[PDB]
Amino acid sequence: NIKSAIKRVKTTEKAEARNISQKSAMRTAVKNAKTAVSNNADNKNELVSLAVKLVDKAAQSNLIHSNKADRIKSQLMTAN
Amino acid sequence: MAREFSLEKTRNIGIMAHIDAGKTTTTERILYYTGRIITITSAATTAAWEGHRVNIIDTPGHVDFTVEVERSLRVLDGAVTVLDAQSGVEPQTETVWRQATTYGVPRIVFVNKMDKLGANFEYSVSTLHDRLQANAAPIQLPIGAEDEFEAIIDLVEMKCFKYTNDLGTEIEEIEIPEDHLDRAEEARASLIEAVAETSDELMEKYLGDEEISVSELKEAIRQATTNVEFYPVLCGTAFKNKGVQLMLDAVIDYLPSPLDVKPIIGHRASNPEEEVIAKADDSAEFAALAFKVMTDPYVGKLTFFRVYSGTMTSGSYVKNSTKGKRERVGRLLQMHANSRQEIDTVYSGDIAAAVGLKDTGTGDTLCGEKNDIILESMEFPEPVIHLSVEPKSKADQDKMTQALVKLQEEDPTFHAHTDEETGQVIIGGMGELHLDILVDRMKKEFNVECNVGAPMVSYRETFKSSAQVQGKFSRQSGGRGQYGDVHIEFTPNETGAGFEFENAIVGGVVPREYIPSVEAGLKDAMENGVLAGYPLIDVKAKLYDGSYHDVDSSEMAFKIAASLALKEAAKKCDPVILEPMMKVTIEMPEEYMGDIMGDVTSRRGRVDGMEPRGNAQVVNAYVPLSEMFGYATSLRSNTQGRGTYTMYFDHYAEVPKSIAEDIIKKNKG
RNA sequence: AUGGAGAGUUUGAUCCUGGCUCAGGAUGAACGCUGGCGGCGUGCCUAAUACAUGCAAGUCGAGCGAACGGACGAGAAGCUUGCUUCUCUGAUGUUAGCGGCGGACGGGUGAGUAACACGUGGAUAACCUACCUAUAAGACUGGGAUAACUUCGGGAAACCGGAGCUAAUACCGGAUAAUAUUUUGAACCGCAUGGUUCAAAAGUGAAAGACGGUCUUGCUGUCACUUAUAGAUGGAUCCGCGCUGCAUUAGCUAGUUGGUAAGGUAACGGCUUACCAAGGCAACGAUGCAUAGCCGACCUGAGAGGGUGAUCGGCCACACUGGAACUGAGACACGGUCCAGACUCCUACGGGAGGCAGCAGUAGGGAAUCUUCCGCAAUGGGCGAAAGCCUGACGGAGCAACGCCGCGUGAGUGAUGAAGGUCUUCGGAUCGUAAAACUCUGUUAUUAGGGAAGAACAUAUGUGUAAGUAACUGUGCACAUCUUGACGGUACCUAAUCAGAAAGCCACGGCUAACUACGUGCCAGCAGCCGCGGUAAUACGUAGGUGGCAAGCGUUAUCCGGAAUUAUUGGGCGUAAAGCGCGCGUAGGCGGUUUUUUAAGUCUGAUGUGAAAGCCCACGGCUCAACCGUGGAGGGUCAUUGGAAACUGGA
Ligand SMILES: CC(=O)O[C@H]1C[C@@]2(C)[C@@H](C[C@@H](O)[C@H]3[C@@]4(C)CC[C@@H](O)[C@@H](C)[C@@H]4CC[C@@]32C)/C1=C(\CCC=C1CCCC1)C(=O)O
């Protein structure tokens, strides 16, 4: 094993923990917004806005690709 | 850069002794002491003692493994001969002593096992004097025997060392006890007399009654030892750590260096008559002798060699003058008590291991590329036991041949050859133990399971009675007609004279064209056995009459006639079976002569005679080769391992009635 | 026009047919004998067999805390003012760790792959792209942790946990910003789907500081950071055509083929799922089986063709075997992770570890293929502001007649045909101008001196100039100076000494250049074919001589040629091998005369491309040559586009 490889293992584990937390949060927001739009709720627009916020922040963190975020926003805001 | 130890501080020594004398224990203790401010492996181990480099080779004791002793004494400078205190000199002690004498190696004797019950230092020294006829004298005295053994009196410096424990530490240097002072002075006088018997200056100095200086006495002892005229005898117990330091001190003080040793003589490859003296000089050309070859599972093939003259650096090319090829020295290793070290250079008087030598067997000479010197090789004993070997599964015969080749390269004393007459592969070795170990090694290491037995004896046939016989063959009945006829007198020839064909034809009754065909037919029919299938020998065939047809006569017809004549002569002449008889010369002490002669006569052989030779006796006899199976083991049992023998084919003799009948029955069915 | 040779052998003899064989060229060759040197190349083709050991990927202190360290230089005098502690300052420096970037390149291998893998030509209005370049706009305001470290505990080791504390260009909230997303209107355009631009609004997150200059903490340089649009680079997908053997492999396919909806992806798409339908492929060879990395090229041939896919370049695929994802611009990752498997190793028996198809090397296999070498000086790469560090890439050296090319092993005179070998017709012939001897030379060799180029730089130090500045330091550019070589004191040059150290291999019956004597006597032996050898052997072995080559010469193996002997070029089937025993008839192949029309074939012009290296031609540089370099020419059944209508094809 190479010293830099061992270091990369450590940093990869840290980055994975952070990324999976953020991705799970954004997926939860997306599902909540989709449910709110599907069944009209007074919180619909705020939930959709939160979902879009998290989707774009994920795209900027590189967790998802820009086109993936674009598809999510397109479908969410077309439903809403 | 610079050799860490000079030639004046190098000691190449070998530990040799009878079985269980303590060679391995002594080597282990030596390595431990040299390494402190232990696994023994590899041909030689390198250590340091008091600013001196010490190469140690531990040898085997069994007579079956005399190859190792030979190949080590060839390249070594000094030897430590270990003796069990309770028994002194034993048969293999004598054998290794004679090998060291043949190689002119200085020796120091070390009486180990002083703590063992029955230990008797005086008796061991007396055995040195009597059994070996060696000018050996103690340079020490033991205070105590068996459990009482507690001190050693160095006589050169008249100083007592008292050992307070078995750990080998906390030795007290004190003055000789008063009660032992007279004995110590007498022993010192005896030692001085022994050395003076070789040194004239010391003899005059001692006769003058003037006190001998410690340095002068040490110098005289060193001179005598290196001349191989004196043998210092020490004592101790390697198991309980007593006398090991003194033994190492004696190694330093008395055993020679590669300078003190006599030079080495070699032959130029292009001028065999030319002689080259290779002295221990780093600045001279590089010449070394490869004395061991092995395969280490980590580094590959290792070639252990001793360097006599010159220097050689790792990562270079050398010449194998014996094989006349170029070898790449890629890596040089030296084995220490606990680890192997890669060393960039080897100098005269160094034992090292090369990695990467291909086609370099034991006894080869490695010389500088430009040079072409060839050092003297080693002579090893001829096989004393032979066994017909054969794989249990014929599918492994190629593996068996390859294993035999590799084993022969590893071990000079192990031979394998194919016998044309019997078509059997025969393995020859130094003893039953040697062959058993080799068979097991072939079975396991080389994964070729083999079975071994007594070699087959190629018998012969002969005619005991003379007779005139006729052979006629008429085949005119169908198609081509053939006719042949011969009259031949068969006579028992003088034993060993071979087949003799005579042509007493008068009047051209047998045309001269067909006579060679008749002789050839006789030769073929005799090659084919007439009584048991073995070739017929010692016969005089006299073609004295015959007939022929102007057309039907042919070479094949006359060969048929000769074959029929031989068949009828076999019917009429009472053939007998002959067995090879070996001229056997047995050397042994006279006290076993009766046993040896009894065994000879019990082997169906006869004692030709007896004669003294040196300090032993030689018995000459003739024994059947079949009855000579397993003779070495019986001889060693009869002579306590002191008996040796040689055998060579001598002649053929008639097999007794019962044995011949058994042979005939076996061949028939 | 640049280019094409044949011979032996079936018979008593002949012509034909017909196979066999030979003369040529080639090689990553091996072996046998032999072996002087230099230059340039090439060197595990077998076991994608297993691997001891060393090395092959690090770097950044000008991102960060901490630790070690201790100049310059404080204090008391031990009365030693030269040695001394802690109460200091502590600079030049070094590091384990956090963080950034690089570990996806470079290097190895050809196992798998018959497939859009590759080649060639196209397409993407179905796509993605860190570092780099350009332009424009920004970089505001707060916060919580954690490594390190200290401590306690458990371990043979691998190393593990608990507690407490601290940093950042590490992480997170909020603020403003959009060509990105939703909706509405408008303009224009295209190859269906659609594309480009403008105007309105609603949802909406980015960022960071480090080292300096001016010092007015205001301004500001370099580097770094963020958003957007372009360029460059790299990658992805699709398509026409081309690219292999077998039918003693004929049926294959059920997410299979299409549609609808959704999901999924950078992206289109049965890519996946649900539903409906029964479609899709195939004698134009599906499916199955076997074998195989493909190409530029390489060998051979007059060509057409045939054979091959080392070295070098491109593309692909793989990293003990199989699966998977993580991080990341980029991997489903040779010297990363997880799981499973085989195998192997260490262990204190509690438990741990590994993957040379990287460079060397080991073992093994094999007829057979090298050093566990030197250096980053050159070129290239990663990191760094830079010096610099790393770099088994690479540049060199070492070994091997393995190949090609060059030069040696001497030159002149020398009849007096010397000795001696071999033959003889016993005169002589021949080895032979060969030798001897006299003269000459030193390529080579030995010795002693001189001694390159490859080296550009970068950095540092001086100025000059240009954008910006309020002005510097800096930044770009230009001119100068110090310094940088593993090879290596090697190449090369000079001076002296000696023909002195340096020739072997095969063949001599015909093919096929070169003949005699002895020995042998169908024996020993030779042999590519025909054959030779039983007493007169140019064929076996030796000797003299001769022939061909020569540091090589022979043998074996394999490929093309000769072979028109699979015949398109370029053959045949009465009797030599070859007409189905004969009809009827399907697909296919082929098809009578004239007129009009089309332009698929056919012919012709333009444009792009067919990398580089290679082959061929020319020129230039190594003293020559090989070799190296530079131009030219060539190579498509290639594509787009414009033209002609005789023939074939269509109407
Ligand atoms: C000094 C040392 O180390 O001796 C060793 C080394 C040793 C001499 C060995 C005996 C034997 O195996 C030897 C042979 C000849 C065996 C055949 C080949 O394998 C060769 C290559 C091999 C070479 C040497 C070898 C390996 C030893 C030995 C004797 C063992 C004792 C026994 C008692 C009865 C059973 C056996 C010893 O311990 O004295």
Ligand SMILES: Nc1nc2c(ncn2[C@@H]2O[C@H](COP(=O)(O)OP(=O)(O)O)[C@@H](O)[C@H]2O)c(=O)[nH]1
């Ligand atoms: N009593 C006693 N035993 C000893 C001594 N030296 C060795 N031994 C033992 O005797 C045997 C000798 O064997 P070893 O040393 O291998 O001898 P080798 O056959 O010469 O190699 C072993 O069992 C040793 O332990 C000694 O000095 N005294």
Ligand SMILES: [Mg+2]
């Ligand atoms: Mg022993």
Ligand SMILES: [Mg+2]
């Ligand atoms: Mg393959």
Ligand SMILES: [Mg+2]
């Ligand atoms: Mg041709």
Ligand SMILES: [Mg+2]
């Ligand atoms: Mg990697």
Ligand SMILES: [Mg+2]
């Ligand atoms: Mg590896």
Ligand SMILES: [Mg+2]
């Ligand atoms: Mg390798």
Ligand SMILES: [Mg+2]
């Ligand atoms: Mg082998």
Ligand SMILES: [Mg+2]
């Ligand atoms: Mg042809």
Ligand SMILES: [Mg+2]
């Ligand atoms: Mg016929």
Ligand SMILES: [Mg+2]
């Ligand atoms: Mg017919």
Ligand SMILES: [Mg+2]
């Ligand atoms: Mg080209």
